[PDB]
Design a protein around this motif. Structure first.
Motif, PDB file in Angstrom:
ATOM      1  N   UNK B 198       0.962  -1.136  -0.005  1.00 28.08           N
ATOM      2  CA  UNK B 198       0.086  -0.027  -0.177  1.00 28.08           C
ATOM      3  C   UNK B 198       0.940   1.290  -0.084  1.00 28.08           C
ATOM      4  N   UNK B 199       0.107   2.380  -0.342  1.00 23.09           N
ATOM      5  CA  UNK B 199       1.003   3.675  -0.458  1.00 23.09           C
ATOM      6  C   UNK B 199       1.708   3.709   0.982  1.00 23.09           C
ATOM      7  N   UNK B 200       2.691   4.727   1.017  1.00 17.96           N
ATOM      8  CA  UNK B 200       3.245   5.201   2.243  1.00 17.96           C
ATOM      9  C   UNK B 200       2.501   6.575   2.748  1.00 17.96           C
ATOM     10  N   UNK B 201       2.212   6.410   3.842  1.00 13.78           N
ATOM     11  CA  UNK B 201       1.789   7.705   4.882  1.00 13.78           C
ATOM     12  C   UNK B 201       2.602   8.238   5.221  1.00 13.78           C
ATOM     13  N   UNK B 202       3.531   8.067   6.175  1.00 12.53           N
ATOM     14  CA  UNK B 202       4.168   8.447   6.969  1.00 12.53           C
ATOM     15  C   UNK B 202       5.797   8.132   6.788  1.00 12.53           C
ATOM     16  N   UNK B 203       6.774   8.826   7.244  1.00 15.25           N
ATOM     17  CA  UNK B 203       8.125   8.743   6.830  1.00 15.25           C
ATOM     18  C   UNK B 203       9.037   7.645   7.774  1.00 15.25           C
ATOM     19  N   UNK B 204       8.692   7.685   9.256  1.00  8.06           N
ATOM     20  CA  UNK B 204       9.448   6.862   9.984  1.00  8.06           C
ATOM     21  C   UNK B 204       8.570   5.507  10.655  1.00  8.06           C
ATOM     22  N   UNK B 205       7.366   5.243   9.841  1.00 10.11           N
ATOM     23  CA  UNK B 205       6.784   4.109  10.308  1.00 10.11           C
ATOM     24  C   UNK B 205       5.904   3.595   8.946  1.00 10.11           C
ATOM     25  N   UNK B 206       5.828   2.110   8.884  1.00  8.15           N
ATOM     26  CA  UNK B 206       5.141   1.570   7.604  1.00  8.15           C
ATOM     27  C   UNK B 206       3.504   1.801   7.808  1.00  8.15           C
ATOM     28  N   UNK B 207       2.937   2.591   8.365  1.00  7.88           N
ATOM     29  CA  UNK B 207       1.440   2.728   8.504  1.00  7.88           C
ATOM     30  C   UNK B 207       0.984   2.971   7.072  1.00  7.88           C
ATOM     31  N   UNK B 208      -0.531   2.454   7.131  1.00  4.70           N
ATOM     32  CA  UNK B 208      -1.048   2.411   5.895  1.00  4.70           C
ATOM     33  C   UNK B 208      -2.481   2.836   6.109  1.00  4.70           C
ATOM     34  N   UNK B 209      -3.260   2.919   4.913  1.00  8.48           N
ATOM     35  CA  UNK B 209      -4.643   3.574   4.723  1.00  8.48           C
ATOM     36  C   UNK B 209      -5.486   2.941   5.440  1.00  8.48           C
ATOM     37  N   UNK B 210      -6.620   3.522   5.813  1.00  9.31           N
ATOM     38  CA  UNK B 210      -7.861   2.971   6.293  1.00  9.31           C
ATOM     39  C   UNK B 210      -8.481   1.962   5.389  1.00  9.31           C
ATOM     40  N   UNK B 211      -8.514   2.471   4.122  1.00  8.77           N
ATOM     41  CA  UNK B 211      -9.004   1.637   2.925  1.00  8.77           C
ATOM     42  C   UNK B 211      -7.968   0.663   2.341  1.00  8.77           C
ATOM     43  N   UNK B 212      -7.804  -0.311   2.635  1.00  5.32           N
ATOM     44  CA  UNK B 212      -6.729  -0.996   1.597  1.00  5.32           C
ATOM     45  C   UNK B 212      -7.081  -1.166   0.190  1.00  5.32           C
ATOM     46  N   UNK B 213      -6.003  -1.339  -0.630  1.00  4.78           N
ATOM     47  CA  UNK B 213      -6.194  -1.639  -2.054  1.00  4.78           C
ATOM     48  C   UNK B 213      -5.488  -2.908  -2.436  1.00  4.78           C
ATOM     49  N   UNK B 214      -5.027  -3.021  -3.911  1.00  3.00           N
ATOM     50  CA  UNK B 214      -4.395  -4.350  -4.257  1.00  3.00           C
ATOM     51  C   UNK B 214      -3.744  -3.986  -5.449  1.00  3.00           C
ATOM     52  N   UNK B 215      -2.618  -4.898  -5.774  1.00  4.20           N
ATOM     53  CA  UNK B 215      -1.688  -4.494  -6.860  1.00  4.20           C
ATOM     54  C   UNK B 215      -2.636  -4.357  -8.093  1.00  4.20           C
ATOM     55  N   UNK B 216      -3.310  -5.429  -8.647  1.00  9.48           N
ATOM     56  CA  UNK B 216      -4.214  -5.278  -9.768  1.00  9.48           C
ATOM     57  C   UNK B 216      -5.468  -5.956  -9.700  1.00  9.48           C
ATOM     58  N   UNK B 217      -6.470  -5.906 -10.496  1.00 12.31           N
ATOM     59  CA  UNK B 217      -7.400  -6.636 -10.649  1.00 12.31           C
ATOM     60  C   UNK B 217      -8.235  -6.637 -12.054  1.00 12.31           C
TER      61      UNK B 217
END
Lengths: 223, 225, 229, 223, 225, 49
Positions: B198-217
């Motif tokens: 998933x997309x990077x939200x912050x700089x010093x932690x691997x946090x992610x979005x409240x809405x998860x996505x996918x590589x491709x469908x």
């Protein structure tokens, strides 16, 4: 007093040019490198490990992204047609993007090798049945039926083997650009009473030793 | 389809990418002091963060290059001072700070007429390897009374910081822009992990979005290609 | 299979896989006590319940044994710690059950929270999520391992598959993996143990709706050292 | 006629760059270096010599700065708690700044080694008594009492030994960040008549052979 | 935590630090003659005096560098002459002095467009080693009739003096500022002594304040940390 | 194609710097040095008379 002509392209700054420069701290001695068990020297090492193949790339909902990993076999459909795994081209978009191989192939432009795809049946122990996996080379279209699919490169998979069935695809290149593997119902899903009438199977895929990548390109979504 | 040297750790990372740009305008709100401090961020280059996070432990040298011009790309007769401030030593706060004079902070004195300054920074970490992922807390103490935003923080990967300024007692006559390029040299990677989903939200932690996505469908259905 | 006062019964003819091809060794360096008495026995975590709706579980090492075992008394009294682990995940099912458990070991498993909305502004995960003890913690979003890291490629870590049709136990031996020869015990969690459903549990109605996941683990080459706090 | 491209970073002046330049006086022959008995080649040599440790860093008056060096033991307090020497971190501010080791550690940022701290009792010859020195590793807090302090790394010091008691602390690092040594009254100060009822003891501290410093930094107050 | 080369005499001192700045303004009170004389002071760099006084006897080469620009850091088409005047030879007094022509005073002729001039000065002392501390008097005579301010003075450590000027018969057209950097090369130190405790009051003697201070006194009490 | 960085103090003209330069007449062969009885190699020779 030593003759020297400055040849064209002197003060140029080429990013890929491999030269040496003055050390910013020429006395600083970095902490000696101890041992750390896992190490990687070539990305191909990662390209050769089996990673879950999202053949069931149909759902999109956030609470159903786990359905992507496994695709179902059930007593419902008989001698029909299960699922057509995307073309043998780990670089192109689709199911192969779930693999580590796929994400790595996104960091290069050209690649060539053989790929292994082991399928893992996760039904009950009492469940049996026969599936027909068949790979059809590029150019040629998807076989219209099973019998016609059987007359080509094919593999009979019985559930006397839990997962050991694994397809080895010969060659993958870059310029039906690439060949596609299809999985077929050779035999209907058969279970006793008390046994679930629907089962899911996980696909795992990797590259063989002879797989390589060539021209590098940084194509990542984020950031 | 024969040579495998293309996919080595070295040839995969070794490439000078634009890693940060220093702006020293004639007059503005950004840098009215004619100087700036740039902490060395490997994640300055966009694709580099997702790259290096393929592994957990890493070790490398880094070759820095400084392409300096005016915002029009015009080269002007201006003298520049690029100072490296090691992890220990403190960063300069004012333009007349005694940090610019301290010898243990190595400095580079170039001109825009001179080809981009080039120096090499050794492996700075006190540990045996860098560490993009720290499942814990830096301090080795019972201190658990504050807001623990120290999770994921690993102040041992600190590579120091460069300090760009226009040499001289008086402010520069020309508007300048200094671009910084980092190139990873001798590289070793250790523990492999799956590549960012998933997309990077912050700089010093691997946090992610409240809405998860996918590589491709792409496949609208499993049956049809 | 008996080591000390602890006696467990399992198959000694399975597929034992060693993490990154390296057995836990003793540190023969300068960074610095080697107990293998009552810190060598098997520790058996409380059983978890493999269920249809299950998302997955993880455990943080060496945090899982910080308060639970005698092992903990040496980890909480010494400011330095170093050890490998023998992990044995086994579930008991019948031939009428289905499922597939991926048991894996990802070193430096940093957990992430979420941040929806037009403006993303999140805090940092609590201790219960970060260091869940021996109880473990259930994954919130399993497909991205609560860290934006896809489970699709989890197999690059020390892994074993538990297919109720095929397998029953999964054994992983993990050596001390760290950037330092000696680190803290109550502060740094060297790795996390992931046990996640890929193929979900299913069964015709009338069968026992919960398959028991049992975790039996013992530190192979525990070497605490440091001094007594 | 010799091909040469000028690679990026030519006319740069890096202060740490170690190169050679033209001699301003290429015929001047400096007076030959004779022998001078004391010589230093590595600063660690100085780091390994014992220097007075100002554990009693309490007074500040100009006419009482000599009280800093020694801390007192007296018949007054019995089986109580003498003094807690600052944490084992020769670089950080405090008592360790009186040592040459400390001032040197101020000229570097990272350091790692073992330290020796010999304590020197300077009471009367007729005076005896037992003190309990105990080192408690970092992270763990200061032991609440002597008995609890005894259950850890500890050293019984009797005044049958004048100074020979010397604590060896295992390891010192950089990121209770560092462990602290405490000195305890195991036994009350006991003297005969005509013998002073208060005595002072000097602490001396050095680094062992295995002590090293790494990244250099010039942090001096003056000038 | 393995290599000990970091703490050697060489790597401790060897580092080019700003050691003095020459100011040649267009018009002012400082240098209305467009020239200046700079005696080589190791104590030009701040932290260097307390450093070298850790030892009593020392010996070294020194590499000098001259970063020259306008007070704005602008480089201008100006020709400069850096002249080294050895301990023996006399320093120039006027801009048309015959000291600028005397060959035995080596001169460097650079341009601001040319990278900073770099030369190397050998061990100049007539003694076998430099000497920051002289417990006595230089003269070997009964002369004791004057005000003995010669205490602590050791005119054998004289390293000479540089002489900066704008080349030409007529005054320079541009306002200039010449910065001097000294870097100690081959170094040997002899007798170790304790590091400076109090602030430096003067230049040629270790005098101190009437009010003595201390390194640090954080502990409010001996008992509590 | 040969990497070279120009280190500080390039185009400087140091009077005492001992280097070699191009010959203004690279074919001119000076009249061979015959013998002349008195010669001096070190000024100390004069200092000793």
């Amino acid at each position: 007093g030593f003759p020297t002509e400055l040849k064209p392209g002197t003060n140029q700054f080429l990013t890929t040019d491999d030269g040496v420069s003055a050390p910013i701290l020429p006395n600083f001695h970095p902490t000696p490198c101890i041992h750390i068990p896992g190490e990687v020297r070539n990305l191909l090492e990662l390209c050769q490990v089996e990673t879950i193949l999202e053949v069931n790339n149909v759902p999109t909902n956030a609470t159903s992204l786990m359905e992507r990993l496994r695709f179902p076999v059930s007593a419902q459909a008989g001698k029909g047609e299960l699922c057509a795994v995307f073309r043998a081209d780990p670089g192109r978009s689709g199911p192969w993007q779930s693999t580590l191989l796929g994400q790595l192939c996104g960091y290069y432009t050209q690649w060539s090798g053989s790929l292994e795809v082991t399928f893992m049946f996760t039904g009950s122990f009492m469940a049996t049945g026969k599936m027909l996996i068949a790979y059809t080379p590029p150019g040629g279209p998807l076989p219209k039926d099973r019998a016609t699919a059987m007359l080509g490169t094919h593999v009979i998979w019985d559930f006397g083997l839990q997962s050991s069935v694994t397809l080895v695809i010969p060659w993958i290149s870059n310029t039906y650009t690439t060949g596609l593997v299809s999985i077929w119902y050779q035999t209907n899903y058969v279970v006793p009473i008390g046994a679930p009438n629907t089962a899911y199977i996980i696909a795992l895929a990797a590259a063989q030793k002879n797989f390589t990548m060539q021209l590098c390109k940084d194509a990542s979504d984020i950031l | 389809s024969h040579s495998t040297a293309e996919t080595t750790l070295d040839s995969f990372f070794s490439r000078a990418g634009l890693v940060g740009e220093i702006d020293l305008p004639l007059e503005g709100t950004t840098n009215p002091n004619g100087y700036a401090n740039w902490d060395i961020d490997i994640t300055g280059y966009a694709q580099m963060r997702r790259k290096v996070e393929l592994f957990t432990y890493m070790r490398f040298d880094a070759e820095f290059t400084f392409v300096a011009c005016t915002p029009t790309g015009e080269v002007v007769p201006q003298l520049l001072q690029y100072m490296f401030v090691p992890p220990g030593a403190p960063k300069p706060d004012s333009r007349e700070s005694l940090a610019w004079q301290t010898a243990t902070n190595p400095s580079v004195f170039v001109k825009l007429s001179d080809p981009p300054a080039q120096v090499s920074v050794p492996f700075m970490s006190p540990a045996s390897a860098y560490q993009w992922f720290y499942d814990g807390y830096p301090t080795f103490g019972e201190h658990k009374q504050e807001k623990d935003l120290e999770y994921g923080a690993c102040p041992n990967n600190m590579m120091g910081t460069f300090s760009v300024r226009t040499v001289g007692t008086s402010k520069s006559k020309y508007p300048l822009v200094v671009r910084i390029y980092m190139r990873m040299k001798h590289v070793r990677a250790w523990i492999p992990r799956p590549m960012r989903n998933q997309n990077y939200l912050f700089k010093a932690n691997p946090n992610y979005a409240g809405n998860s996505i996918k590589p491709t469908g792409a496949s609208r259905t499993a049956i049809t290609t | 299979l008996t080591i000390g006062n602890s006696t467990i019964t399992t198959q000694e003819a399975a597929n034992i896989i060693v993490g990154y091809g390296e057995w836990p060794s003793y540190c023969s360096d300068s960074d610095a006590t080697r107990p293998d008495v009552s810190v060598n026995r098997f520790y058996t975590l409380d059983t978890k319940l493999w269920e249809k709706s299950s998302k997955g579980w993880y455990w943080k090492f060496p945090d899982v044994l910080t308060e639970t075992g005698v092992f903990g008394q040496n980890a909480q009294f010494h400011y330095l710690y170093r050890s490998g682990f023998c992990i044995h995940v086994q579930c008991n099912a019948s031939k009428f059950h289905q499922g597939a458990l991926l048991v894996a070991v990802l070193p430096e498993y940093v957990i992430g929270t979420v941040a929806g909305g037009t403006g993303t502004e999140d805090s940092h995960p609590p201790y219960k999520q970060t260091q869940p003890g021996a109880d473990g913690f259930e994954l919130q979003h399993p497909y991205v391992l609560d860290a934006g890291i896809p489970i699709s490629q989890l197999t690059v870590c020390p892994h074993q598959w538990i297919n109720l049709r095929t397998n029953n136990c999964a054994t992983i031996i993990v050596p001390y993996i760290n950037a330092l020869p000696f680190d803290s015990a109550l502060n740094h969690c060297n790795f996390g143990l992931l046990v996640v459903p890929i193929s979900p549990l299913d069964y015709d109605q009338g069968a026992t709706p919960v398959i028991p996941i049992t975790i039996t683990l013992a530190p192979m080459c525990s070497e605490f050292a440091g001094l007594r706090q």
